[PDB]
Design a protein around this nucleic acid. Structure first.
Ligand SMILES: [K+]
Ligand SMILES: [K+]
Ligand SMILES: [Mg+2]
Ligand SMILES: [Mg+2]
Ligand SMILES: [Mg+2]
Ligand SMILES: [Mg+2]
Ligand SMILES: [Mg+2]
Ligand SMILES: [Mg+2]
Ligand SMILES: [Mg+2]
Ligand SMILES: [Mg+2]
Ligand SMILES: [Mg+2]
Ligand SMILES: [Mg+2]
Ligand SMILES: [Mg+2]
Ligand SMILES: [Mg+2]
Ligand SMILES: [Mg+2]
Ligand SMILES: [Mg+2]
Ligand SMILES: [Mg+2]
Ligand SMILES: [Mg+2]
Ligand SMILES: [Mg+2]
Ligand SMILES: [Mg+2]
Lengths: 50, 77, 124, 240, 244, 97
RNA sequence: GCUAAACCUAGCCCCAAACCCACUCCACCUUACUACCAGACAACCUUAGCCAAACCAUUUACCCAAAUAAAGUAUAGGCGAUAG
RNA sequence: CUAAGAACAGCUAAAAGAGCACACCCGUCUAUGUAGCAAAAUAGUGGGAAGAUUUAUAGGUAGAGGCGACAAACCUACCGAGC
RNA sequence: CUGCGUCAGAUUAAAACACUGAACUGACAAUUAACAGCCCAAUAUCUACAAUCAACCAACAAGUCAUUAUUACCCUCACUGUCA
RNA sequence: CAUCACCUCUAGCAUCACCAGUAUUAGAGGCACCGCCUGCUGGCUCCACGAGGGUUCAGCUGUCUCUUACUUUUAACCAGUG
């Protein structure tokens, strides 16, 4: 999630879980030729590939 | 003899304690409750702190004499 | 000749400046010796997605619905709906004491809880 | 200025320590000594000027064997690497010192004088009168500070009541206790003052910058003006 | 435009609201008072009227104090109200000669004193004036207790007063625990300076220190509404049973 | 103590009002430095025998460089407070009786 | 007849009155607007000068808490300029 | 000035603040230009080009001063005292 | 810091031109990490012998590169730069 | 101007410059190598070197006697901008 404070993690701590996410992605058509399996999204800056 | 390490490069002496601590039966008023430094309040004396859990990235070894494999006789390696 | 009224981002500056500045994404690990990054599984936020099979509710609401007035939830309202019914039953029975408030649902301290209320240690 | 002295090492070692030049600048960043700047990079080799420093597990007189006499950039004189027991340290080499020689370091003061050998360290109370000495100390445990430069040598003029008169290379007498440890003989690089720089470029190799081009009419006598007394003020200058 | 209040009144206006208004009443009196300190670096006239020699008339005279600069190091000792005098002088004491900046500094000594109430010795920096004042007060403890705040001119001097007053108020047995008779004797000598513990705990504190002290007394975790509502619910239920 | 005086007269302010100081009112002239005045003798009541006087309760006067340094820190003497005199007066009275 | 020319509001000024503002989430003293590791660094100190004195060198007005009046008086001052 | 880096063909020579001569640095003479391409440039001709060299990066010294192989030079295109 | 990619434009001055006119306006599109940057548990303890093909030889201006002992530790490829 | 070389002056010592140094050193200066001569500091000679300032042999050439021809830019005219 974005614009929220992530709880700090230390060794042996609980798993970080998010139940409601505010990340909204949008599928877009690539402007250039792409491989068949490749899919292009627009994601918020705070979002990682993981 | 000539000591190695000029006093400027060594850690400076901590500032002298405020005179409020020298008066018995007197509780100093410090900035420990404000959680930040201010010049017009006494400097609190913080007790030593322990992390409370084992962290490999921030581990500090015990003193050398406290190591289990410590012998008075030296071994040349 | 530099633009001082534009947003300072990771795309500006030399190589050391560009790699040190980010975009706001939270860190999910740390760097070890040899510039090797170690990703911590517990630092990666895991999505708790429920099963939506056989779910009645839908994104929109039909217009053929009454215009109910809005009643914001308050602490006093929640206490009466949840805790008050239990206390009344115990009050009539005659077994009531402040020592047993933990049994009614009261939490004297937030330590030792997976989801602490203040300060909260969970995401939205 | 954010000036931190490189002299931060606290443990002695024979490893050459990298040092940063000052350029005549103090901690503030302004020039305090002129004509200093640039030159070839140098690594400082720590010198133990306290010749009598017995080991932690040892005491009393001990002996050291010279390993190598080499060139030191920091000082005019050469230095020698010696090994005594299980340690090695740098000392100031004498004029006649080679690899393999054995030097003696003692704090013993006998009833009579002893045969003084060049490079050995004995107290001033056990050295014959007139013997050339170098690397003297003001008081015991102070360390050698005087007669360090290449070829310099002092003179043991006299010894009376536990004190000795040392003739410094500047022909000045100095009185110190007879228990001060000194090194017998002259210092290495006797012909150091006989060198020729050859060109202005070699002075820039030693970290010395050219002098200011201003014509200073001021000097020891020219700049300082004796104030004429009112009676003598009339005779200061006479037209001719 | 104009301000509602003069600018010089804003300092006393901030004491009307906020945590300052919640400070004890006796403490607020000690700050708003402007008692004139005892003259040190100038000779007072001694009378309200004098006869001007030139015209032989009875003219009014006033004592105008000379500003005194107290260095920060003066707050860790007992200078007796002395301090650096930042002023000008005329060369050769001639008005027609040029004017030069002159600073007069007191002579400081690191003398040691012993306090009977605190049973502890201090190595403080004092002037020759402070030594004379302790001699005229017949002991360090009397000097600290008699000398007012504007005359001590030292934060350490006011801290000693607060410490001494608390021992005279709390009747703390920490003073000579092995000699109860001696402890009573010391408290019976300074009995003229008895101050209640409530008022003796704010003596010498500055405005910033008092604000911090008051905030600590007001610092508390908010009461959960569960306890509040349960108290309301039980009280309501008890009243309900009465009607039945 | 440096005691100084203003070269220039300060005009009267009145009752309840602060005087108006000018740039010229910062010019001072030294009147007297109390460090150069003749010394005085501190009056003390001795508790133990000393070389000057060996009688307890006998009022003595010595230089301030002696009472402050030796007599008072060592407990040899006490300040000549009026209350102390009354207490020692009773002690002397018991000796006579 | 082109370029142009005309317009009346926006708002502002001076008073009176009354003592003003700053937590929606997130980020912000490190290279501010940068989630996340042993610090110990800490504040306070006369204003000067231009200018006037036909130079300049002592000196030269600067709200200090009630409008008026006492009064530009007593005083101060290279007993000058001026200050009060 | 400090820190830690980089650059210098070929040839004659020799372990050279050597010679010739590119890159590079500098700017001797002449001409063009003079609101110009340019608030100092252009073309040709020149001095140096393994060294007291040239140069990129970061840091330091600030105006009652700094710095200066003294030209009263320079300190952000008016420095006998910056803005 | 999007600054001759695409499309459209009552378009229309880049020191001339311009319909496709285009180094103008609007919209849309884009530069994908392996390269580079962002590194490291503690406490002690170690590190005399240049470089120059480093072997000759010859130097001074004396130099640009090293650990071990014990304790702790076995989770894994994120982030940012990428156009003209 | 600086410059090796020479000379004068100052300083007997350490924990931020000098310096992690110690009178064969450091600083403040003069002069400008060397060689010869001199006093008890002064004057000549000389190797190379110089975008320094003069002079000169020979050659060279439109520098000139005495200018001329051609090419390019400019130029003038046409169009655009201005
Ligand atoms: K004038
Ligand atoms: K030349
Ligand atoms: Mg700008
Ligand atoms: Mg010189
Ligand atoms: Mg000169
Ligand atoms: Mg009045
Ligand atoms: Mg004038
Ligand atoms: Mg004039
Ligand atoms: Mg050459
Ligand atoms: Mg050449
Ligand atoms: Mg230069
Ligand atoms: Mg000149
Ligand atoms: Mg001139
Ligand atoms: Mg400028
Ligand atoms: Mg990589
Ligand atoms: Mg010259
Ligand atoms: Mg001629
Ligand atoms: Mg000819
Ligand atoms: Mg022809
Ligand atoms: Mg035309």
């Amino acid at each position: 999630a974005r614009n929220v404070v992530y709880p700090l993690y230390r060794l042996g701590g609980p798993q970080l879980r998010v139940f409601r996410t505010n990340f909204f992605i949008q599928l877009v058509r690539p402007g250039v030729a792409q491989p068949e399996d490749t899919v292009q999204f627009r994601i918020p800056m705070e979002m990682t590939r993981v | 003899a000539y000591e190695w390490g000029v006093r400027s490069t060594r850690k400076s002496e901590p500032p002298p304690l405020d005179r409020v601590y020298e008066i018995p039966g007197l509780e100093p008023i410090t900035f420990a409750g404000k959680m930040h430094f201010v010049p017009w309040l006494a400097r609190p004396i913080f007790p030593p702190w322990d992390r409370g859990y084992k962290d490999p990235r921030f581990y500090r070894s015990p003193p050398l004499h406290e190591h289990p494999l410590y012998k008075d006789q030296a071994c040349y390696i | 000749g530099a633009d001082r009224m534009s947003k300072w981002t990771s795309k500006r500056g030399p190589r050391s400046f560009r790699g040190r500045k980010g975009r706001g994404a939270k860190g999910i690990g740390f760097l070890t010796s040899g510039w090797r990054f170690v990703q911590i599984k517990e630092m990666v936020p895991e999505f708790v997605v429920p099963d939506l099979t056989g779910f009645k509710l839908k994104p929109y609401v039909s217009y053929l619905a009454p215009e109910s007035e809005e009643t914001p939830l308050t602490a006093a309202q929640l206490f009466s709906e949840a805790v008050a019914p239990a206390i009344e039953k115990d009050f009539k029975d005659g077994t009531f004491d402040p020592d047993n408030l933990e049994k009614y649902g009261f939490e004297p301290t937030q330590e030792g809880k997976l989801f602490q209320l203040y300060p909260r240690n969970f995401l939205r | 200025a954010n000036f931190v002295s490189w002299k931060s090492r606290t443990k002695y070692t024979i490893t050459p320590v990298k040092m940063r030049k000052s350029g005549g600048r103090d901690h503030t960043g302004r020039i305090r000594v002129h004509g200093i700047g640039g030159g070839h990079k140098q690594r400082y080799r720590m010198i133990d000027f306290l010749r009598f420093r017995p080991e932690e597990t040892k005491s009393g007189p001990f002996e050291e064997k010279v390993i190598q006499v080499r060139y030191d950039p920091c000082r005019s004189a050469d230095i020698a690497l010696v090994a005594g027991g299980s340690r090695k340290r740098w000392i100031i080499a004498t004029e006649n010192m080679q690899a393999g020689d054995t030097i003696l370091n003692s704090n013993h003061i006998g009833r009579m004088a002893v045969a003084a050998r060049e490079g050995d360290a004995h107290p001033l109370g056990a050295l014959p009168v007139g013997t050339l000495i170098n690397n003297v100390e003001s008081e015991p445990g102070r360390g050698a500070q005087y007669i360090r430069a290449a070829g310099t040598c002092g003179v043991l003029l006299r010894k009376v009541n536990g004190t000795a008169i040392i003739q410094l290379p500047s022909k000045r007498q100095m009185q110190v206790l007879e228990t001060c440890v000194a090194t017998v003989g002259r210092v290495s690089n006797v012909d150091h003052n006989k060198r020729v720089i050859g060109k202005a470029g070699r002075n820039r190799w030693l970290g010395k910058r050219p002098n200011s081009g201003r014509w200073h009419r001021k000097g020891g006598w020219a700049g300082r003006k004796i104030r004429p007394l009112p009676p003598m003020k009339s005779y200061v200058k006479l037209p001719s | 435009p104009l301000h509602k209040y003069p600018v010089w009144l804003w300092k006393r206006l901030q004491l009307r609201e906020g945590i300052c208004s919640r400070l004890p009443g006796h403490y607020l009196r000690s700050l708003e008072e402007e008692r004139t300190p005892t003259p040190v670096h100038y000779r007072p006239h001694g009378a309200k009227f004098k006869i001007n020699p030139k015209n032989g008339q009875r003219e009014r005279v006033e004592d105008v104090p000379i500003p005194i600069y107290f260095p920060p190091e003066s707050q860790r000792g007992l200078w007796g109200g002395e301090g650096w005098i930042l002023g000008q002088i005329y060369a050769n004491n001639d008005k027609l000669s040029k004017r030069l900046k002159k600073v007069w500094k007191p002579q400081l000594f690191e003398r040691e004193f012993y306090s009977e109430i605190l049973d502890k010795k201090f190595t403080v920096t004092v002037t020759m004036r402070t030594l004379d004042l302790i001699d005229e007060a017949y002991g360090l403890d009397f000097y600290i207790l008699k000398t007012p705040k504007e005359d001590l001119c030292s934060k350490f001097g006011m801290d000693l007063k607060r410490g001494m007053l608390l021992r005279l108020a709390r009747q703390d047995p920490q003073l000579h625990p092995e000699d109860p008779e001696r402890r009573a004797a010391i408290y019976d000598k300074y009995k003229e300076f008895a101050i209640p513990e409530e008022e003796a705990e704010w003596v010498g504190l500055t405005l910033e220190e008092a604000i911090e002290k008051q905030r600590l007394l007001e610092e508390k975790d908010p009461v959960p509404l569960f306890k509040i509502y349960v108290a309301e619910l039980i009280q309501q239920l008890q009243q309900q049973a009465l009607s039945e | 103590t440096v005691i100084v005086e203003r070269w220039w007269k300060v005009p009267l302010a009145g009752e309840g009002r602060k005087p108006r100081l000018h740039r010229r009112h910062r010019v001072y002239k030294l009147v007297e430095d109390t460090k150069h005045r003749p010394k005085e003798n501190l009056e003390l009541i001795l508790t133990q025998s000393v070389e000057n006087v060996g009688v307890r309760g006998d009022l003595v006067s010595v230089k301030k460089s002696l009472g402050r340094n030796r007599l008072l820190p060592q407990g040899l003497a006490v300040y000549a407070s009026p209350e102390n005199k009354k207490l020692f007066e009773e002690e002397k009275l018991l000796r006579q009786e």
